Amino acid sequence: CTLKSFTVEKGIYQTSNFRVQPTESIVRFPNITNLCPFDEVFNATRFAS
Amino acid sequence: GTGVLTESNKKFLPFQQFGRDIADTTDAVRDPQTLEILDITPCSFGGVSVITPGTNTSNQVAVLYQGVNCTEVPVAITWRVYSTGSNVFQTRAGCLIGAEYVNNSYECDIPIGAGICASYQTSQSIIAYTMSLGAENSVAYSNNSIAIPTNFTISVTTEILPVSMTKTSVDCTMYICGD
Amino acid sequence: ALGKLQDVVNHNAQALNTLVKQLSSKFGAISSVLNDIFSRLDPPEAEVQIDRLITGRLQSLQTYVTQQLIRAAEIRASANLAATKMSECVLGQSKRVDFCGKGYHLMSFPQSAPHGVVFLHVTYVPAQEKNFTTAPAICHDGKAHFPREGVFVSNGTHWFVTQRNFYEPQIITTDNTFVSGNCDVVIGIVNNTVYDP
Amino acid sequence: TMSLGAENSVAYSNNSIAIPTNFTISVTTEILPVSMTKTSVDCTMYICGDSTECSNLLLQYGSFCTQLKRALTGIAVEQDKNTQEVFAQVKQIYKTPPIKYFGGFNFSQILPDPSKPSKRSPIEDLLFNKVTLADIKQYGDCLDLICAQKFKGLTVLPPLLTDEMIAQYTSALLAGTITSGWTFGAGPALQIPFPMQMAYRFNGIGVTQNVLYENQKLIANQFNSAIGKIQDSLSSTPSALGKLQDVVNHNAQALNTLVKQLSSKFGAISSVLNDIFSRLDPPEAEVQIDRLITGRLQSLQTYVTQQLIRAAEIRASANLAATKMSECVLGQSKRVDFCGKGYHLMSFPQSAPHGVVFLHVTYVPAQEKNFTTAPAICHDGKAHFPREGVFVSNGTHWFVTQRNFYEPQIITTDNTFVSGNCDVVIGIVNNTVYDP
Amino acid sequence: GTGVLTESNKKFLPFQQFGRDIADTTDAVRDPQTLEILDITPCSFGGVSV
Ligand SMILES: *[C@@H]1O[C@H](CO)[C@@H](O[C@@H]2O[C@H](CO)[C@@H](O)[C@H](O)[C@H]2NC(C)=O)[C@H](O)[C@H]1NC(C)=O
Ligand SMILES: *[C@@H]1O[C@H](CO)[C@@H](O[C@@H]2O[C@H](CO)[C@@H](O)[C@H](O)[C@H]2NC(C)=O)[C@H](O)[C@H]1NC(C)=O
Ligand SMILES: *[C@@H]1O[C@H](CO)[C@@H](O[C@@H]2O[C@H](CO)[C@@H](O)[C@H](O)[C@H]2NC(C)=O)[C@H](O)[C@H]1NC(C)=O
Ligand SMILES: *[C@@H]1O[C@H](CO)[C@@H](O[C@@H]2O[C@H](CO)[C@@H](O)[C@H](O)[C@H]2NC(C)=O)[C@H](O)[C@H]1NC(C)=O
Ligand SMILES: *[C@@H]1O[C@H](CO)[C@@H](O[C@@H]2O[C@H](CO)[C@@H](O)[C@H](O)[C@H]2NC(C)=O)[C@H](O)[C@H]1NC(C)=O
Ligand SMILES: *[C@@H]1O[C@H](CO)[C@@H](O[C@@H]2O[C@H](CO)[C@@H](O)[C@H](O)[C@H]2NC(C)=O)[C@H](O)[C@H]1NC(C)=O
Ligand SMILES: *[C@@H]1O[C@H](CO)[C@@H](O[C@@H]2O[C@H](CO)[C@@H](O)[C@H](O)[C@H]2NC(C)=O)[C@H](O)[C@H]1NC(C)=O
Ligand SMILES: *[C@@H]1O[C@H](CO)[C@@H](O[C@@H]2O[C@H](CO)[C@@H](O)[C@H](O)[C@H]2NC(C)=O)[C@H](O)[C@H]1NC(C)=O
Ligand SMILES: *[C@@H]1O[C@H](CO)[C@@H](O[C@@H]2O[C@H](CO)[C@@H](O)[C@H](O)[C@H]2NC(C)=O)[C@H](O)[C@H]1NC(C)=O
Ligand SMILES: *[C@@H]1O[C@H](CO)[C@@H](O[C@@H]2O[C@H](CO)[C@@H](O)[C@H](O)[C@H]2NC(C)=O)[C@H](O)[C@H]1NC(C)=O
Ligand SMILES: *[C@@H]1O[C@H](CO)[C@@H](O)[C@H](O)[C@H]1NC(C)=O
Ligand SMILES: *[C@@H]1O[C@H](CO)[C@@H](O)[C@H](O)[C@H]1NC(C)=O
Ligand SMILES: *[C@@H]1O[C@H](CO)[C@@H](O)[C@H](O)[C@H]1NC(C)=O
Ligand SMILES: *[C@@H]1O[C@H](CO)[C@@H](O)[C@H](O)[C@H]1NC(C)=O
Ligand SMILES: *[C@@H]1O[C@H](CO)[C@@H](O)[C@H](O)[C@H]1NC(C)=O
Numbered sequence: 001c002t003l004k005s006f007t008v009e010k011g012i013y014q015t016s017n018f019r020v021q022p023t024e025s026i027v028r029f030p031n032i033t034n035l036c037p038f039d040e041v042f043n044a045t046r047f048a049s
Numbered sequence: 050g051t052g053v054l055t056e057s058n059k060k061f062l063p064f065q066q067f068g069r070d071i072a073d074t075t076d077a078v079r080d081p082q083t084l085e086i087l088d089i090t091p092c093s094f095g096g097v098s099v100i101t102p103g104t105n106t107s108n109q110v111a112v113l114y115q116g117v118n119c120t121e122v123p124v125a126i127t128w129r130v131y132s133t134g135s136n137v138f139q140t141r142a143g144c145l146i147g148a149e150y151v152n153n154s155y156e157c158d159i160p161i162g163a164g165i166c167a168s169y170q171t172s173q174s175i176i177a178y179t180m181s182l183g184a185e186n187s188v189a190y191s192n193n194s195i196a197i198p199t200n201f202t203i204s205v206t207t208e209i210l211p212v213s214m215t216k217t218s219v220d221c222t223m224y225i226c227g228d
Numbered sequence: 229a230l231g232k233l234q235d236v237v238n239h240n241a242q243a244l245n246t247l248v249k250q251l252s253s254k255f256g257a258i259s260s261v262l263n264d265i266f267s268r269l270d271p272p273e274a275e276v277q278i279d280r281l282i283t284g285r286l287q288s289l290q291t292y293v294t295q296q297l298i299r300a301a302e303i304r305a306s307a308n309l310a311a312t313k314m315s316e317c318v319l320g321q322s323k324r325v326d327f328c329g330k331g332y333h334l335m336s337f338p339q340s341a342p343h344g345v346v347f348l349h350v351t352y353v354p355a356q357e358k359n360f361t362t363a364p365a366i367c368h369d370g371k372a373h374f375p376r377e378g379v380f381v382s383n384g385t386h387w388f389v390t391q392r393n394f395y396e397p398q399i400i401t402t403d404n405t406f407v408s409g410n411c412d413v414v415i416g417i418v419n420n421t422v423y424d425p
Numbered sequence: 426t427m428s429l430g431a432e433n434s435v436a437y438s439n440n441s442i443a444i445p446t447n448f449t450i451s452v453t454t455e456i457l458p459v460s461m462t463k464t465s466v467d468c469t470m471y472i473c474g475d476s477t478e479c480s481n482l483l484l485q486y487g488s489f490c491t492q493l494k495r496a497l498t499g500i501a502v503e504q505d506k507n508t509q510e511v512f513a514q515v516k517q518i519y520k521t522p523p524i525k526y527f528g529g530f531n532f533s534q535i536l537p538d539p540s541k542p543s544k545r546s547p548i549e550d551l552l553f554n555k556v557t558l559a560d561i562k563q564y565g566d567c568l569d570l571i572c573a574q575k576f577k578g579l580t581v582l583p584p585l586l587t588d589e590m591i592a593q594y595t596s597a598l599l600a601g602t603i604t605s606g607w608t609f610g611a612g613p614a615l616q617i618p619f620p621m622q623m624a625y626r627f628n629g630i631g632v633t634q635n636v637l638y639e640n641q642k643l644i645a646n647q648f649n650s651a652i653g654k655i656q657d658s659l660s661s662t663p664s665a666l667g668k669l670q671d672v673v674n675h676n677a678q679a680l681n682t683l684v685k686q687l688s689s690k691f692g693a694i695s696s697v698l699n700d701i702f703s704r705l706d707p708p709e710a711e712v713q714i715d716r717l718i719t720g721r722l723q724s725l726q727t728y729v730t731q732q733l734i735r736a737a738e739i740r741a742s743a744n745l746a747a748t749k750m751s752e753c754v755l756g757q758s759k760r761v762d763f764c765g766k767g768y769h770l771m772s773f774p775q776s777a778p779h780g781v782v783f784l785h786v787t788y789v790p791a792q793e794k795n796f797t798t799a800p801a802i803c804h805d806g807k808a809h810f811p812r813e814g815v816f817v818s819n820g821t822h823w824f825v826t827q828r829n830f831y832e833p834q835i836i837t838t839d840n841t842f843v844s845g846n847c848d849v850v851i852g853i854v855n856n857t858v859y860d861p
Numbered sequence: 862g863t864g865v866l867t868e869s870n871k872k873f874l875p876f877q878q879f880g881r882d883i884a885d886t887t888d889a890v891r892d893p894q895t896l897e898i899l900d901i902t903p904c905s906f907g908g909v910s911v
Contacts, residue, residue, distance in 0.1 A: 195359070
């Protein structure tokens with residue numbers, strides 16, 4: 001394919017590149033704990049009119 | 050990023066999170082979950098080259114993986130990568146699969162590199178051999194020893210030198226804007 | 229051995245087909261056919277697509293000319309060398325080592341070839357060497373004698389003088405050897421009789 | 426305003442002639458680049474790394490990668506050829522004699538050292554360390570300047586001939602010159618004692634072989650001392666090795682430039698390809714991406730074009746080095762200034778990183794003395810002309826001596842061939858020509 | 862396109878409609894009204910030197 005010919009002569013020819021493919025995906029938590037106080041707003045004893 | 054991830058020995062200042070090397074790619078990143086620094090190197094890559102005696106002389110071939118440790122490349126990883134049973138030789142150029150290294154030295158036929166060459170020889174198989182510089186001759190230097198030729202031979206040798214290349218002209222307009 | 233001439237033909241041919249394959253290259257356009265772009269695109273937007281194709285063809289043309297110019301210099305260097313070999317070897321005997329053949333250069337014969345010149349170098353190669361015992365000079369009558377144009381040589385019994393390239397033993401004569409100095413100064417001097425005609 | 430040089434006036438007259446009375450054997454160093462680093466570039470991941478979308482446009486853009494790979498391959502193949510022609514001149518590997526006595530001539534510095542791990546001469550080891558500042562199969566860090574290239578794909582291919590094999594070639598060339606002189610180059614090697622071989626070379630420069638023989642010890646002391654001065658001269662940091670260093674610096678500068686062109690936007694919104702694909706929509710991404718590929722492609726083309734021009738210069742140097750190998754090292758060369766300065770006696774080759782260092786042994790006349798001279802001598806009505814010397818007048822008696830060294834001889838019929846008459850020639854001086 | 866048109870001797874398969882050269886430019890085509898394979902070649906060109 002690389003030589004684009006059916007016959008190939010004596011010698012050494014660079015043809016392609018081999019690469020290892022990623023096994024799986026990783027995403028990283030920033031350890032964020034800035035949770036919203038909407039819960040106690042939801043868990044409110046009284047609501048406005 | 051995409052690459053194999055390992056621990057990082059190099060220290061990081063508190064403000065800096067990731068580090069880019071002289072290649073300007075991030076070579077070390079600190080884990081957001083656990084502030085420990087980790088070293089990132091890309092997944093192993095390399096180019097492949099095929100050593101072939103020629104289509105006339107059988108279809109047996111040997112392939113060399115440039116600049117890659119023999120243990121680095123698995124036998125599984127499009128091609129079957131032959132097999133571990135196939136002879137594996139580790140060279141400075143890289144890992145070579147499918148050729149027998151021999152201790153006999155022969156004149157180069159296909160240059161693998163770093164003093165290694167391969168050829169199709171018989172039970173014909175591809176064999177990798179160390180370069181043979183030439184025949185070893187020792188000439189006896191002495192205080193009073195001289196050699197004088199008693200005969201001569203007339204030899205004719207051929208030298209071939211390119212002189213001219215095919216003159217070429219280009220009609221620019223029809224190549225760029227044809228018809 | 230004509231592969232060098234063959235390579236010149238292959239490089240010019242292969243580069244020429246390369247320019248042809250670059251025509252089919254899209255260069256980011258819609259089609260590689262210029263007339264198709266004109267039919268498929270109205271003039272305002274067509275200019276954007278045509279320009280991308282135009283530089284793509286232009287860049288390929290520029291690269292081919294640059295490759296040819298570098299190739300032309302390589303051939304010109306070979307041609308200048310070949311012209312020098314024409315004069316230095318064919319037109320006369322050259323004492324430059326290995327310039328004209330291997331060994332001592334007797335002559336050279338030129339033969340024409342397609343897009344090149346083939347040189348047939350006639351060379352003198354010594355053979356059938358025979359070892360000998362030699363001395364820097366011969367002490368005969370208290371004056372050191374040096375070989376004028378030869379080398380002092382004995383096979384074991386009698387000293388002789390011969391030309392360096394070929395073994396031809398001549399008896400030591402006054403005409404054969406020029407005399408200077410005394411015997412003691414020269415190291416390795418060997419006693420022998422210098423015959424006077 | 427710079428000085429062109431010192432101003433010296435040489436007194437010219439009809440009668441005045443200067444004949445040297447002493448000689449200085451000088452050894453000079455010539456450094457010639459022979460090869461450059463063979464570089465191969467993975468086109469796709471130079472253009473874009475882990476960019477599946479970019480592979481589509483790159484394939485659509487054309488097959489530009491094939492020519493760049495082919496052009497780089499031609500340079501790499503040619504580089505290995507250059508070292509082959511320069512060094513592999515002699516087919517037969519020659520071994521140095523176990524005896525190191527060569528009539529007082531000391532070759533320890535240029536001869537390979539068995540004690541040193543690499544079979545290299547002390548000069549060669551010094552040459553390597555001077556250039557070793559510019560130069561990883563383990564790639565333990567990288568699975569560090571080398572990785573900055575392979576992380577982008579710019580890869581260095583090891584030379585086909587390693588340094589030890591080159592060192593073996595140089596030692597073989599050294600053995601042939603010492604043992605056989607010029608004979609090993611033309612044909613089969615013929616042993617000849619070294620004082621005779623140097624005496625032969627003295628005849629080549631025009632000095633009779635006797636002059637060397639009486640002054641053998643003085644020449645040996647001069648030659649041995651001259652070799653020593655080369656070591657400290659090479660040990661001096663300002664050196665001609667920069668020419669070899671320029672080749673590696675040129676390779677390094679080009680490799681860094683390609684790295685910068687990656688960060689170069691070429692007018693793009695962001696240098697990073699990931700930003701192009703992420704923020705913008707696929708329609709907007711293509712326009713920004715296409716400009717990036719064109720800029721990356723142009724940088725690769727300029728690098729290959731520049732590399733081809735630089736490779737041609739090395740080829741011209743390699744051809745010059747190969748010619749210097751055959752013309753000077755293998756045999757005595759009459760071409761003036763081709764090998765060293767002054768009359769060339771012989772040359773010694775020493776391998777260097779990516780180059781070869783030539784040690785030219787040259788004959789330099791010294792201690793010249795003025796003399797009065799006549800074109801011919803009239804003795805008995807027929808003019809006499811010196812056969813191979815010059816008529817030199819001591820001021821009281823005339824003498825004939827060789828033209829490169831002062832050795833006065835009494836005029837004899839053998840010394841001077843007779844021709845013509847006395848009146849025709851101008852400046853002929855009356856004298857007596859002794860007949861043996 | 863612009864060119865000179867002659868009857869094409871190239872044997873042309875029933876499913877095949879277009880022919881392309883090494884450069885992949887269209888060199889043969891079948892007429893729409895009646896399927897007639899016709900080779901297309903460029904009109905005569907040539908450099909001129911004075
Ligand atoms: C001339 O002198 C002697 C005669 O035999 C040779 O010395 C030995 O020659 C053999 C083969 O030629 C070598 O293998 C030995 O190594 C030589 N002896 C030593 C001590 O080295 C010498 O070689 C002869 N010269 C030639 C050109 O044949
Ligand atoms: C030449 O013969 C001499 C022997 O006379 C040797 O060379 C050196 O000679 C001196 C004085 O006799 C000794 O002190 C040295 O030891 C000799 N050199 C060596 C290396 O031993 C030697 O035998 C001959 N040289 C050759 C053949 O190159
Ligand atoms: C020198 O030249 C050649 C050797 O290279 C010799 O010629 C050969 O001589 C033998 C016997 O006389 C013949 O059988 C061969 O056919 C000859 N060969 C050729 C090519 O002619 C010649 O005899 C040698 N002479 C000396 C004195 O060495
Ligand atoms: C070394 O010198 C010469 C050259 O061969 C030899 O002397 C000749 O020997 C033959 C043999 O009897 C005689 O017929 C000649 O008349 C001799 N010539 C002269 C000029 O004397 C001598 O024999 C050689 N040495 C050996 C050991 O062979
Ligand atoms: C040989 O003698 C002549 C005559 O004295 C020298 O010519 C003069 O030399 C002196 C010093 O050497 C210079 O200052 C003069 O300029 C020379 N004369 C002229 C006209 O230039 C000559 O130089 C002597 N040869 C050598 C080698 O010193
Ligand atoms: C060399 O000798 C000649 C005398 O033959 C002088 O040079 C010139 O010679 C011509 C012809 O005899 C005279 O016409 C000139 O007048 C001479 N020139 C001078 C300056 O004398 C001269 O004696 C010598 N040349 C020198 C010393 O340069
Ligand atoms: C020529 O050779 C050198 C200058 O090139 C000189 O010889 C010196 O002689 C003195 C006297 O003993 C020694 O101390 C020096 O060592 C010698 N020089 C060297 C380099 O060894 C002198 O000018 C001339 N000598 C002769 C013998 O002609
Ligand atoms: C050739 O020269 C070298 C260099 O001077 C000599 O080696 C030196 O030998 C002395 C005494 O053995 C040591 O102190 C030096 O350190 C040595 N120098 C080196 C660079 O090795 C060597 O002996 C000389 N050989 C001959 C035959 O003259
Ligand atoms: C010219 O050279 C000769 C020879 O060297 C010198 O004359 C010699 O002088 C000594 C005593 O002074 C005599 O014993 C010799 O017989 C002389 N030789 C001849 C050939 O007569 C003379 O001194 C030199 N001339 C000059 C000007 O130095
Ligand atoms: C060398 O000597 C000859 C002969 O002595 C000189 O020739 C002249 O010949 C004429 C006619 O025979 C005579 O006047 C004298 O015999 C010579 N004249 C002079 C002035 O010597 C010749 O001139 C002399 N050459 C030199 C340079 O002195
Ligand atoms: C190439 O193939 C032909 C045809 O099979 C054969 O005759 C020839 O020997 C082959 N060349 C080599 C070098 O094997
Ligand atoms: C050849 O050399 C290798 C190491 O270089 C060694 O392992 C082997 O035993 C030697 N002999 C053979 C026959 O391979
Ligand atoms: C040659 O013979 C003379 C005469 O006896 C002698 O003085 C000299 O030493 C001899 N030389 C040699 C090398 O034997
Ligand atoms: C390949 O890796 C192994 C261990 O991982 C190591 O021992 C060997 O030296 C490496 N090969 C090369 C050529 O560096
Ligand atoms: C129009 O072309 C079609 C086939 O291409 C066919 O009906 C006929 O050849 C043409 N019609 C007329 C009326 O000529």
